[PDB]
Amino acid sequence: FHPYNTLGLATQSAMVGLGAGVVAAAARNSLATGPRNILTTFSKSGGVVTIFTGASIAYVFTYCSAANLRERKDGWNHMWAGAATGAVLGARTKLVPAFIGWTVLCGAACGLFGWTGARFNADRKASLEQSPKGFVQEDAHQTFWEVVHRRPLSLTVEQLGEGRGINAVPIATATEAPN
């Protein structure tokens, strides 16, 4: 893999999250009920600014950091980032259990979101429609979506491991009489 730049992305992410807080502040000031003005935007707003900034900071910082600590690109990183984000959002309610719950469940949802590829879109070339499928023809390596009538035994022993009934050679032939 190629490492991430933690502070460069975190500074961009914070300015972005500050901008989103400004937009949501203005939109609330317009959509709200009672007498207001241009002052109320950052006074009477329910923490939209600190919500957005703390989330974007914590998410991107944790994803890039754990991508660099684990030294990989995968879904476990998005899980840790959603765990931080849940901590931040749940710290607003000043309770321990809801803080722990917000953390775990935001983390599981972002961790699933990284499992499925960390995108709401689709790859469109790793998909089944645009990829080889069906029966492989002649002894060729079995890809993901391909089907096979008879699998190699060496590949089985490697993917699984030996023992628990599963062996390099069958049991009868292994114990056949040399006759």
Partner 1 sequence: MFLTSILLSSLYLFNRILAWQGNVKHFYLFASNLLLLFIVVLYINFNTFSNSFQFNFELFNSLNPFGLSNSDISNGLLFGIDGLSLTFILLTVLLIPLTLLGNWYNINFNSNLYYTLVLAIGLVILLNFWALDYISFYILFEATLPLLFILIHIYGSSDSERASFYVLMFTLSGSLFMLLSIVVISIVLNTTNFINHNLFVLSLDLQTIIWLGLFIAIMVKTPLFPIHVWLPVVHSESPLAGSMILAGLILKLALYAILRLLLPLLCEAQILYTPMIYIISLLTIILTSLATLRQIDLKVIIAYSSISHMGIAILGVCSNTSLGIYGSIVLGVAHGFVSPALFLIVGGILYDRYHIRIVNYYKGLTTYMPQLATYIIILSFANIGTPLTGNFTGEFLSLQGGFIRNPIIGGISCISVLLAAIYQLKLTNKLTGGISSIYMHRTNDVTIREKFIMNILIISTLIIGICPQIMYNLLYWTVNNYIYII
Partner 2 sequence: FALRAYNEEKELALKQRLSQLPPPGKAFVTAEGEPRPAKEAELAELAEIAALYKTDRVGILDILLLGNKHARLYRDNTALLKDYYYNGRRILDKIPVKDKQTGKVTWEIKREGAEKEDWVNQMYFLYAPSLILLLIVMVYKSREDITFWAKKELDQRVLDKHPEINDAPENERDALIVERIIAGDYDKLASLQKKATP
Partner 3 sequence: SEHQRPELVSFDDINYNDHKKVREAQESYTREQFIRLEALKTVRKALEKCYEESGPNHFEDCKNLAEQYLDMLPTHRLQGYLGYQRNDPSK
Ligand X SMILES: CCCCCCCCCCCCCCCCCC(=O)OC[C@H](COP(=O)(O)OCCN)OC(=O)CCCCCCCCCCCCCCCCC
Ligand Y SMILES: CCCCCCCCCCCCO[C@H]1O[C@H](CO)[C@@H](O[C@H]2O[C@@H](CO)[C@H](O)[C@H](O)[C@@H]2O)[C@H](O)[C@H]1O
Tell me if 142 contacts partner 1 by CB under 8 A: yes
The two tokens of residue 52 are 């957005």
Exactly one of 163, 165, 178, 179 binds partner 3 (CB under 8 A); that residue is: 165
Tell me if 27 contacts partner 3 by CB under 8 A: no
Exactly one of 139, 144, 159, 177 binds partner 3 (CB under 8 A); that residue is: 139
Tell me if 22 contacts ligand X by CB under 6 A: yes
Tell me if 14 contacts ligand X by CB under 6 A: no
The two tokens of residue 6 are 């933690």
Picked from partner 1, ligand Y, partner 3, none, the partner binding residue 147 (CB below 5 to 8 A depending on kind) is partner 1
Q: How far is CA 13 from CA 40, 123, 151, 160, in A?
A: 25, 25, 48, 42
Tell me if 7 contacts ligand X by CB under 6 A: no
3-state secondary structure of 112: helix
Exactly one of 1, 8, 12, 23 binds ligand X (CB under 6 A); that residue is: 23
Nearer to partner 3, 15 or 153 (CB): 153
DSSP single-letter state for residue 141: P
Q: Give which of 119, 65, 60, 116 is closest to 85, Cα–Cα.
A: 60
For the segment 125-154, give every residue that binds ligand Y (CB under 6 A). 126, 143-144
d(CA 141, CA 159): 14
